[PDB]
Enzyme design. Structure first.
Site, PDB file in Angstrom:
ATOM      1  N   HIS A  51      52.379-117.269  25.926  1.00 32.11           N
ATOM      2  CA  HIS A  51      54.002-117.119  25.505  1.00 32.11           C
ATOM      3  C   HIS A  51      54.137-117.862  24.537  1.00 32.11           C
ATOM      4  O   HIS A  51      54.086-119.439  24.893  1.00 32.11           O
ATOM      5  CB  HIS A  51      54.432-116.579  26.632  1.00 32.11           C
ATOM      6  CG  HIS A  51      54.195-115.951  28.088  1.00 32.11           C
ATOM      7  ND1 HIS A  51      53.204-116.304  28.930  1.00 32.11           N
ATOM      8  CD2 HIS A  51      53.990-114.957  28.491  1.00 32.11           C
ATOM      9  CE1 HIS A  51      53.172-115.393  29.802  1.00 32.11           C
ATOM     10  NE2 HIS A  51      54.059-114.149  29.179  1.00 32.11           N
TER      11      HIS A  51
ATOM     12  N   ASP B  21      55.874-120.740  26.739  1.00 30.19           N
ATOM     13  CA  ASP B  21      54.658-122.071  27.492  1.00 30.19           C
ATOM     14  C   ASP B  21      54.691-123.033  26.793  1.00 30.19           C
ATOM     15  O   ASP B  21      54.384-124.468  26.945  1.00 30.19           O
ATOM     16  CB  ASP B  21      53.306-120.791  27.634  1.00 30.19           C
ATOM     17  CG  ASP B  21      53.288-120.330  28.575  1.00 30.19           C
ATOM     18  OD1 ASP B  21      54.187-120.113  29.820  1.00 30.19           O
ATOM     19  OD2 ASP B  21      52.581-119.545  28.268  1.00 30.19           O
TER      20      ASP B  21
ATOM     21  N   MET C 262      45.073-114.430  21.840  1.00 32.57           N
ATOM     22  CA  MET C 262      45.463-113.620  21.855  1.00 32.57           C
ATOM     23  C   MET C 262      46.823-114.573  21.993  1.00 32.57           C
ATOM     24  O   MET C 262      46.442-115.864  22.461  1.00 32.57           O
ATOM     25  CB  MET C 262      45.777-113.145  23.443  1.00 32.57           C
ATOM     26  CG  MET C 262      46.612-111.955  23.755  1.00 32.57           C
ATOM     27  SD  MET C 262      47.236-112.462  24.327  1.00 32.57           S
ATOM     28  CE  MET C 262      46.828-112.967  26.148  1.00 32.57           C
TER      29      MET C 262
ATOM     30  N   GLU D  34      50.660-103.665  28.473  1.00 30.21           N
ATOM     31  CA  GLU D  34      49.824-104.518  29.500  1.00 30.21           C
ATOM     32  C   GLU D  34      51.475-103.599  30.572  1.00 30.21           C
ATOM     33  O   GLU D  34      51.834-104.302  30.563  1.00 30.21           O
ATOM     34  CB  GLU D  34      50.212-105.476  29.341  1.00 30.21           C
ATOM     35  CG  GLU D  34      49.344-106.019  31.006  1.00 30.21           C
ATOM     36  CD  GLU D  34      49.689-107.663  30.860  1.00 30.21           C
ATOM     37  OE1 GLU D  34      49.297-108.187  29.888  1.00 30.21           O
ATOM     38  OE2 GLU D  34      49.490-108.439  31.887  1.00 30.21           O
TER      39      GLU D  34
ATOM     40  N   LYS E 108      52.302-101.984  33.800  1.00 27.32           N
ATOM     41  CA  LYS E 108      52.255-103.070  35.992  1.00 27.32           C
ATOM     42  C   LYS E 108      53.266-102.356  36.408  1.00 27.32           C
ATOM     43  O   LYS E 108      54.312-101.374  35.070  1.00 27.32           O
ATOM     44  CB  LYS E 108      53.194-104.501  35.927  1.00 27.32           C
ATOM     45  CG  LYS E 108      53.232-105.317  37.149  1.00 27.32           C
ATOM     46  CD  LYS E 108      54.403-106.745  37.445  1.00 27.32           C
ATOM     47  CE  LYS E 108      53.920-106.873  37.911  1.00 27.32           C
ATOM     48  NZ  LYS E 108      53.668-108.436  38.179  1.00 27.32           N
TER      49      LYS E 108
ATOM     50  N   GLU F  87      45.034-105.032  33.649  1.00 27.36           N
ATOM     51  CA  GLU F  87      45.099-106.298  34.434  1.00 27.36           C
ATOM     52  C   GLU F  87      44.335-105.352  36.001  1.00 27.36           C
ATOM     53  O   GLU F  87      44.956-104.605  36.520  1.00 27.36           O
ATOM     54  CB  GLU F  87      46.156-106.811  34.754  1.00 27.36           C
ATOM     55  CG  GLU F  87      46.093-108.190  35.573  1.00 27.36           C
ATOM     56  CD  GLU F  87      47.086-109.423  35.335  1.00 27.36           C
ATOM     57  OE1 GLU F  87      47.523-109.485  34.250  1.00 27.36           O
ATOM     58  OE2 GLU F  87      48.146-109.854  36.430  1.00 27.36           O
TER      59      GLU F  87
ATOM     60  N   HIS G 277      47.273-104.870  38.328  1.00 30.63           N
ATOM     61  CA  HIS G 277      48.198-104.334  38.320  1.00 30.63           C
ATOM     62  C   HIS G 277      48.075-102.993  38.518  1.00 30.63           C
ATOM     63  O   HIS G 277      48.803-102.458  39.741  1.00 30.63           O
ATOM     64  CB  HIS G 277      48.419-104.191  36.948  1.00 30.63           C
ATOM     65  CG  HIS G 277      49.519-105.885  36.545  1.00 30.63           C
ATOM     66  ND1 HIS G 277      49.814-106.124  35.631  1.00 30.63           N
ATOM     67  CD2 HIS G 277      49.878-107.066  37.472  1.00 30.63           C
ATOM     68  CE1 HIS G 277      50.107-107.231  35.079  1.00 30.63           C
ATOM     69  NE2 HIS G 277      50.055-107.619  36.496  1.00 30.63           N
TER      70      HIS G 277
ATOM     71  N   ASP H 110      42.335-108.923  31.514  1.00 32.97           N
ATOM     72  CA  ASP H 110      43.228-109.329  31.767  1.00 32.97           C
ATOM     73  C   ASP H 110      42.461-109.424  33.498  1.00 32.97           C
ATOM     74  O   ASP H 110      42.468-107.972  34.338  1.00 32.97           O
ATOM     75  CB  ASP H 110      44.612-109.201  32.258  1.00 32.97           C
ATOM     76  CG  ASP H 110      45.290-109.660  31.317  1.00 32.97           C
ATOM     77  OD1 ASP H 110      45.000-110.810  30.548  1.00 32.97           O
ATOM     78  OD2 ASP H 110      46.716-110.360  31.300  1.00 32.97           O
TER      79      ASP H 110
ATOM     80  N   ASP I 216      52.102-108.774  43.786  1.00 28.47           N
ATOM     81  CA  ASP I 216      50.895-109.196  42.673  1.00 28.47           C
ATOM     82  C   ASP I 216      50.411-110.809  42.982  1.00 28.47           C
ATOM     83  O   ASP I 216      51.036-111.468  43.133  1.00 28.47           O
ATOM     84  CB  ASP I 216      51.613-108.781  41.347  1.00 28.47           C
ATOM     85  CG  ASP I 216      50.804-109.583  40.140  1.00 28.47           C
ATOM     86  OD1 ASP I 216      49.603-109.946  40.358  1.00 28.47           O
ATOM     87  OD2 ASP I 216      51.185-109.915  39.156  1.00 28.47           O
TER      88      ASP I 216
ATOM     89  N   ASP J 242      47.887-112.518  41.928  1.00 28.05           N
ATOM     90  CA  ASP J 242      47.287-112.806  40.715  1.00 28.05           C
ATOM     91  C   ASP J 242      45.921-113.750  41.852  1.00 28.05           C
ATOM     92  O   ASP J 242      45.765-115.330  41.369  1.00 28.05           O
ATOM     93  CB  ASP J 242      48.019-114.064  40.332  1.00 28.05           C
ATOM     94  CG  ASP J 242      48.794-113.799  39.253  1.00 28.05           C
ATOM     95  OD1 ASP J 242      47.925-112.014  38.565  1.00 28.05           O
ATOM     96  OD2 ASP J 242      49.726-113.306  38.128  1.00 28.05           O
TER      97      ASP J 242
ATOM     98  N   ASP K  23      43.742-113.723  34.114  1.00 30.78           N
ATOM     99  CA  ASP K  23      45.115-114.039  34.245  1.00 30.78           C
ATOM    100  C   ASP K  23      45.178-113.769  35.873  1.00 30.78           C
ATOM    101  O   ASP K  23      46.026-112.717  36.378  1.00 30.78           O
ATOM    102  CB  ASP K  23      46.166-112.963  33.520  1.00 30.78           C
ATOM    103  CG  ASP K  23      47.726-112.998  33.958  1.00 30.78           C
ATOM    104  OD1 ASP K  23      48.223-114.037  34.348  1.00 30.78           O
ATOM    105  OD2 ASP K  23      48.253-112.206  34.018  1.00 30.78           O
TER     106      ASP K  23
HETATM  107  O1  LIG Z   1      52.720-109.344  35.413  1.00 28.00           O
HETATM  108  C1  LIG Z   1      52.334-110.744  34.792  1.00 28.00           C
HETATM  109  C2  LIG Z   1      51.548-109.847  33.701  1.00 28.00           C
HETATM  110  O2  LIG Z   1      50.656-109.803  33.559  1.00 28.00           O
HETATM  111  C3  LIG Z   1      51.586-111.922  32.565  1.00 28.00           C
HETATM  112  O3  LIG Z   1      50.579-112.615  32.743  1.00 28.00           O
HETATM  113  C4  LIG Z   1      51.207-110.825  31.145  1.00 28.00           C
HETATM  114  O4  LIG Z   1      49.721-110.502  30.754  1.00 28.00           O
HETATM  115  C5  LIG Z   1      52.160-111.874  29.995  1.00 28.00           C
HETATM  116  O5  LIG Z   1      53.477-111.329  29.382  1.00 28.00           O
HETATM  117 MG   LIG Z   2      48.785-109.767  33.039  1.00 30.00          MG
HETATM  118 MG   LIG Z   3      50.121-110.048  37.310  1.00 23.54          MG
END
Ligand SMILES: O=C[C@H](O)[C@@H](O)[C@H](O)CO
Ligand SMILES: [Mg+2]
Ligand SMILES: [Mg+2]
Ligand SMILES: O=C[C@H](O)[C@@H](O)[C@H](O)CO
Ligand SMILES: O=C[C@H](O)[C@@H](O)[C@H](O)CO
Ligand SMILES: O=C[C@H](O)[C@@H](O)[C@H](O)CO
Ligand SMILES: [Mg+2]
Ligand SMILES: [Mg+2]
Ligand SMILES: [Mg+2]
Ligand SMILES: [Mg+2]
Ligand SMILES: [Mg+2]
Ligand SMILES: [Mg+2]
Lengths: 385, 385, 385, 385
Positions: free
Chosen positions: D52, D55, D86, D179, D181, D215, D218, D243, D253, D255, D285
């Protein structure tokens, strides 16, 4: 629908004081001084406040700073007439509690957790709290091999037994309330529901000292019926306290204001507390959304109270309506309250009308008339009678 | 991975005998005679079978037909060496049970339910069952005003107390196991989880006669961790029986074959039963999907057994690996098993290393090394060591 | 709160006609003749009815019996003034559809499914239906290797393309509406949500002929926000029909009466349909619980209608309140409706007030005043203004 | 099972760099310099990294500090051979984005969001990224009246259209990936699933520039089947990126590392990507749990890669086994791939074998043999062939 201190409405300092930090964002509000929260809540009609040790006295405070924090708090209570009916310990924020407090794998951590708790019980008593809550948010795991649950429950039992020995030895008039939650922040938390906490209590050395402090959103995160869970706790005589808020289903803990989330569930909860004569505090564990400024904070806190009072009025109108009392008899709620076999086992065994001559078909054809009853309840909730 | 009767694998008649009717579709398979199921299971290596009263003797059977059904069943058991370790009652199918059995609002229904159960306990004992299961699938509600839960729990307690008085009076060597489920077919079912059932037991007149019969998919329908729930039941000494199957999350009850659904959860379950020395039956409550013919039925039943034996091998390899034993010590599983304060409360209170001189920062920085442990577990499950 | 035919309320024959069979129980009610349902609905104020082919003409009926079933139905419509605005096909009950209709692995099944559908489109047109619904309840899988999804979507597209070619060739004035559902009866169903159905439509040969028929409980079974899903369908111009009912979270499909389940969600749905000027039928796809007799059936159907009319009144009072209109401006709903950069890309790029000189801190401090707005909405819903 | 850069494994800086702050706890790890992450990932066998804007360049950095941050990053890439396939924008952390970026009610915010994005697209291109991701984490609401969804989608479309005009005008070789969610951090997020994002794309001015970046966790937060969602994206030609991670059901979430969570789902995902010839990056991710130190971080990142390679081997063994190829034919997967009616509509209409003379009973009795197929897949995954 104006609250008064006689309504027993209470709030945690961490509620209206939440700065708005979430997993994906920085704070949107500045920190509130506990003294200011006390005054603003009193003005809205609250009866009292609650705290974690760390909400009142910053972690790592010297004994000097500790005393200063307490005296200022105590002055605000005297100025407003606000009470402190419950307190708890923070065993979740600091990194040392990353694998739990009472059930951390490291023994030294476990001993530290007990000492931190004991110190707060003393403060709680001095402030006149009647209930001490334990929410073990870090007691759990993300992976299967990380925690032996049998060993973890032995350590949890050991912790609560020592706490009971402590209050007994001191001659304190305080009871404990365990607050369950199924997940978040750990992948799975130990004692996940009201049921698991109730079962555990029965294995402690002095079960009479411990009850439950259930929270609306927590049971809903498992998709469970909150009013049913509450009725089981009442039935067992273990509803020592309650946490009110809102939640829209199975997802992260939202902590919406009370009334938001599942409104019908809120209606049935109020009905139950008022009917059963629950006389403890009506405590709100919620977070004003991070979209709000200070005006929005106080509006959300006031809404908590307003929704409970609206629901109270509607539930009371429902139970007092002659047409509803008739519907309850039509659905045989009266018969659910009578003993099945007060006559005894022998009598039942000898009774031909209970089996040999029981007309199963006729019984089966009887409608329960539940849908008409539920529509009367809907009409009452909506004020459409 | 060939099962033998010494593996204690059992199946309900209603499992391999499910005809495939669902909420949206007619049966896809013809009915199986219980005698044929007994023979086919024996050939696959099963140890025994279980039944509801109505699976063996058609509802409304005369005493004559009842006797005929029993003798034929008994012959098949003698011919094959198959045992019957558990039985239960059907208090859910017939329309008379539309509002419950033990907690129906109609008192006459409640008395009928108790009589139907008692008659089956006698049969169970004659067949040599050691455990009698109760699954109250219709005990619950779709709407809030339809059931007063406090009254419902009083009726549930009354039912189980009478059943305990009955077995005691008769001198029978049988124990009861309550099987929880959170919903389906009722909107909410009473005693929804392992925890709620455990808590209830403690309020019965003779708690020693009652335990739990948890089912994989049931706890998963609430999003709960099955192996954690099992460890709590073991800790309480209440795991009298267990039902194995598969489920893909929070949705309708799927009853997939064991191993399907959450595979890692199945791995951790096997680890736990084998480690704790569970010596009861390994019972499969599952349904071969309605897409299958008879060949598919037997393939699915065989897969249940095969998956348990594969998981057993992998869990045993994991626990016996020196590299894993080292990892367990690295993650302090050894320290979780030691008492927190065997020294006592006074000693803890006087110990400066537990608080005043505890280095919180150093403790906090210690990694738990859980991810390396979990990858060892993954490698073992996958046979990738 | 009396409905009239001008309110456009419709019901499926299978709703009030559900006999009460579930996965665990036999029917609790006798079958209803379609003619009787037509008369009883008309008396309650409904505008019309809908049907699956198999609800009206028993599977396997000769052409003779088919004609007789139709003429009797048609007479009841003429006698009552009831209309038939939508029809659909049963591609789920019969065992031949165990692996799907349009996407069954067996090609012969797939051809059969298309023929059965075509025959019903002809009937639908004759009865004057404007919309033909497709709910692919058996299109899906319990296991990963059983269905290649890419191939399955090719077959689904082929099916809908042929149906579009058919109506075009015939010169019929009918449009199609796909009804999504995430699971049940299959472990996973293809096109699980409103979003997946919308995306698929865009790949058909003549997209203009197809829209969506979303159902309250279906999106809720995935934990999604129903009013948000509806707004996306409206935005795309694809809301051809809608199915109303109630659901208490993520679990089996309950099909409660409209208003039951998530009441606030029902409030926001009504607000949206009325605001957007939706002019299609208000269709109820629900099941009176199996606890009810015939009186309970009609009470539940009447409640569907009554709840929509109560919500309509409350949503209209909310939008017309000056105090609410002010609150909407306070929360900047007016600014959400204005273009972000009607000035264009160059203008935006050159605008220093959009970045270089944008005061991020001042913007961040502005509260959104959403909690006061939401409490106004709560007060209106509860009639507590 | 050693990864190499040819395996195309990528990681976000925010993954291995997550400090461990959650809703209930402070950070447990110190911040990592992006240069150190680049070197440590290269050593483990990764192909590249993503970021990002925030980051890499701290929010509010002067142009000077910006340049310094970039040159240091670029040197690490040259030293290691690591690529950057990316990049994305942070439109979620800063308080100004509390009500969204592209769909904030305040117009000034919306213009700010577009400018912040544009600036990052330029950087992305300079670094050679091929894909630009958009995750609208704050686009949504906690309450019904706070956001008019129709207006919100108009603003979202306007934002993406302007971004497409920008890249076109500049002559850049970059495509966008949305993306989805379903919730968290907002109560409900707009474009909640893969399906909703696909449908939206079709209404943009130049749809060819936009795809999806789904993802694992998600879609699982909505209880959906990830491999099915992926197959729909592939079918539409829109899988621009992916992802990978793990999630244990419907909850917050988590992860987890890839492979953890739903293992069978991970197996079917790998099968699909490898079979379909997906040639994009395999991006992780995920978050190493807050219980871990730095050693635990690198062990978790390595496990991501190791699990994908194990699954790849097992899926390939499954598809290459003659016994499986036979089973696929037994379950008619071959017939699912053939057109239903390549003969055309007329031919189908005239074909008596498709209806008039179709033997429904014989077709219905054919088992699909799915359970034997699924057990072959289980045996292969477990290496128990
Ligand atoms: O839920 C957060 C996302 O998965 C984040 O990692 C996006 O990929 C980046 O903006
Ligand atoms: Mg993500
Ligand atoms: Mg996530
Ligand atoms: O999930 C967090 C809890 O609800 C918390 O508020 C406890 O009540 C206090 O420790
Ligand atoms: O959900 C149904 C139960 O699992 C059933 O199989 C009980 O075990 C038998 O009464
Ligand atoms: O889940 C079942 C559906 O809602 C059904 O009622 C369709 O509308 C008719 O095919
Ligand atoms: Mg909470
Ligand atoms: Mg709480
Ligand atoms: Mg089950
Ligand atoms: Mg069972
Ligand atoms: Mg439905
Ligand atoms: Mg429907």
């Amino acid at each position: 629908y104006q609250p008064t201190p006689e309504d027993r409405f209470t709030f945690g300092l961490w509620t209206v004081g939440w700065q708005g930090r979430d997993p994906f964002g920085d704070a949107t509000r500045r920190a509130l001084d506990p003294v200011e929260s006390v005054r603003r809540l009193a003005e809205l009609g609250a009866h009292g406040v609650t705290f974690h040790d760390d909400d009142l006295i910053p972690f790592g405070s010297s004994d000097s700073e500790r005393e200063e924090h307490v005296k200022r708090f105590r002055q605000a209570l005297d100025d407003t007439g606000m009470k402190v009916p419950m307190a708890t310990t923070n065993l979740f924020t600091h990194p040392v509690f990353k694998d739990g407090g009472f059930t951390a794998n490291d023994r030294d951590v476990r001993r530290y957790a007990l000492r931190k708790t004991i110190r707060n019980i003393d403060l709680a008593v001095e402030l006149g709290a009647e209930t001490y809550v334990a929410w073990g948010g870090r007691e759990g795991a993300e992976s299967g091999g990380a925690k032996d649950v049998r060993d973890a429950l032995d350590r949890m039992k050991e912790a609560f037994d020592l706490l009971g020995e402590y209050v007994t030895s001191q001659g304190y008039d305080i009871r404990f309330a365990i607050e369950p939650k199924p997940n978040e922040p750990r992948g799975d938390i130990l004692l996940p529901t009201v049921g698991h906490a109730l079962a555990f209590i029965e294995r402690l050395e002095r079960p009479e000292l411990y009850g439950v402090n259930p929270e609306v959103g927590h049971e809903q995160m498992a998709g469970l019926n909150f009013p049913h869970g509450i009725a089981q706790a009442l039935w067992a005589g273990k509803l020592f306290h309650i946490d009110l808020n809102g939640q829209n289903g199975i997802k992260y803990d939202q902590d919406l204001r009370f009334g938001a989330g599942d409104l019908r569930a809120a209606f049935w909860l109020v009905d139950l507390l008022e009917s059963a004569g629950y006389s403890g505090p009506r405590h709100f564990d919620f977070k004003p959304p991070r979209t709000e400024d200070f005006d929005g904070v106080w509006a959300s806190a006031a809404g908590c109270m307003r929704n409970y009072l609206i629901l109270k009025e509607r539930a009371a109108a429902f139970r007092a309506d002659p047409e509803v009392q008739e519907a309850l008899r039509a659905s045989r709620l009266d018969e659910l309250a009578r003993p099945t076999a007060a006559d005894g086992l022998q009598a039942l065994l000898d009774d031909r009308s209970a089996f040999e001559e029981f007309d199963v078909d006729a019984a089966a054809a009887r409608g329960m008339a539940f849908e008409r009853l539920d529509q009367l309840a809907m009409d009452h909730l909506l004020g459409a009678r």
